[PDB]
């Protein structure tokens, strides 16, 4: 198997084979893995080493391997699936029960309007190079300017901006940028190795701007951020329980008796510089993390028939009819809330409740009996599992469940 360009094979005075990298100026005993087809190592203007695929014309600072390429392709599939679900995306909507999301959203709309600057700015991007053009444009403008009316052009403004947010929110996860990773492909995280990208911080600032701009301009994105991510936006405690939402194996190990902030400090700081210069996170604090997710992602009608068709159970379809009564009685927003409580998110797979995914593969919606009646319902979102205590009255199950999903304590 031939050595990549720039490499040489030599033998030392002891007979041991070794390898010289004439480009990086390195020596090593370990034969470098060949690059995958279509990939070429290049040197930029400032002398930095990057890699280019001569079929996608993509580039990366991460030396492409079998794993990195596999991640990239998984992302290609993902991106295409979402993009293909665009029509459904454009149908997403926004606008004792002591939580009033509607009123919060109206207050927030008003707040944005009072900050909105007189029209407008032009953002010029192509579909083929959406990410890079967007980065150059968005970083070229002032925060003030980015609070003006957006005129996005691909060589009615609202639908093209809407589309722009859709598409970019997909592009942002492109593993080639080295910015994000998965804890599975279930839980999105900042990649601790983002450093291999010499410009990672500028890109996180760009993404911060991006997300804040979606919020400010009332546009949905189509990215599967974790609940702790939203919590972090709102300066809310990231506790042990959050670890179950992220890495259930790690949470199990811990539960045998701040690793979700350790590792990505710089990235998170850059992200918030970008975010907070557009829309300071502190003025988002009347929202809770689930509300914030709904605000960024949109609401959707849930198919109750699909939901019921694809649910599994120490109980059966014969106190569960109470649960489904509860689902049918509550409004769209509270169904979104219940969905968040159980699965961790208000976003549904394009295929539906059958295509539901968990922290170690597909895991269908699951309700199981556990606890006493004083017990609040519990959830294990990494397993889409609802811990439903044996309640004796429908009014009690509805009170308890409401109380649970509303997160009253």
Curated annotation (Swiss-Prot):
<feature type="domain" description="HECT">
    <location>
        <begin position="142"/>
        <end position="409"/>
    </location>
</feature>
<comment type="subunit">
    <text>(Microbial infection) Interacts with Epstein-Barr virus LMP2A.</text>
</comment>
<feature type="modified residue" description="Phosphotyrosine; by FYN">
    <location>
        <position position="95"/>
    </location>
</feature>
<comment type="subunit">
    <text>Monomer. Part of a ternary complex composed of SMAD3, ITCH/AIP4 and NEDD9/HEF1; within the complex NEDD9/HEF1 interacts (via N-terminus) with ITCH/AIP4 (via WW domains); the complex mediates ubiquitination and proteasomal degradation of NEDD9/HEF1. Interacts (via WW domains) with OCNL. Interacts (via WW domains) with NOTCH1. Interacts (via WW domains) JUN. Interacts with JUNB; the interaction promotes ITCH-mediated ubiquitination and degradation of JUNB. Interacts with FYN; the interaction phosphorylates ITCH on Tyr-95 decreasing binding of JUNB.</text>
</comment>
<feature type="domain" description="WW 1">
    <location>
        <begin position="1"/>
        <end position="34"/>
    </location>
</feature>
<feature type="active site" description="Glycyl thioester intermediate">
    <location>
        <position position="382"/>
    </location>
</feature>
<comment type="function">
    <text>Acts as an E3 ubiquitin-protein ligase which accepts ubiquitin from an E2 ubiquitin-conjugating enzyme in the form of a thioester and then directly transfers the ubiquitin to targeted substrates. It catalyzes 'Lys-29'-, 'Lys-48'- and 'Lys-63'-linked ubiquitin conjugation. Involved in the control of inflammatory signaling pathways. Is an essential component of a ubiquitin-editing protein complex, comprising also TNFAIP3, TAX1BP1 and RNF11, that ensures the transient nature of inflammatory signaling pathways. Promotes the association of the complex after TNF stimulation.</text>
</comment>
<protein>
    <recommendedName>
        <fullName>E3 ubiquitin-protein ligase Itchy</fullName>
    </recommendedName>
</protein>
<feature type="modified residue" description="Phosphothreonine; by SGK3">
    <location>
        <position position="60"/>
    </location>
</feature>
<feature type="region of interest" description="MAP kinase docking site">
    <location>
        <begin position="147"/>
        <end position="155"/>
    </location>
</feature>
<feature type="domain" description="WW 2">
    <location>
        <begin position="33"/>
        <end position="66"/>
    </location>
</feature>
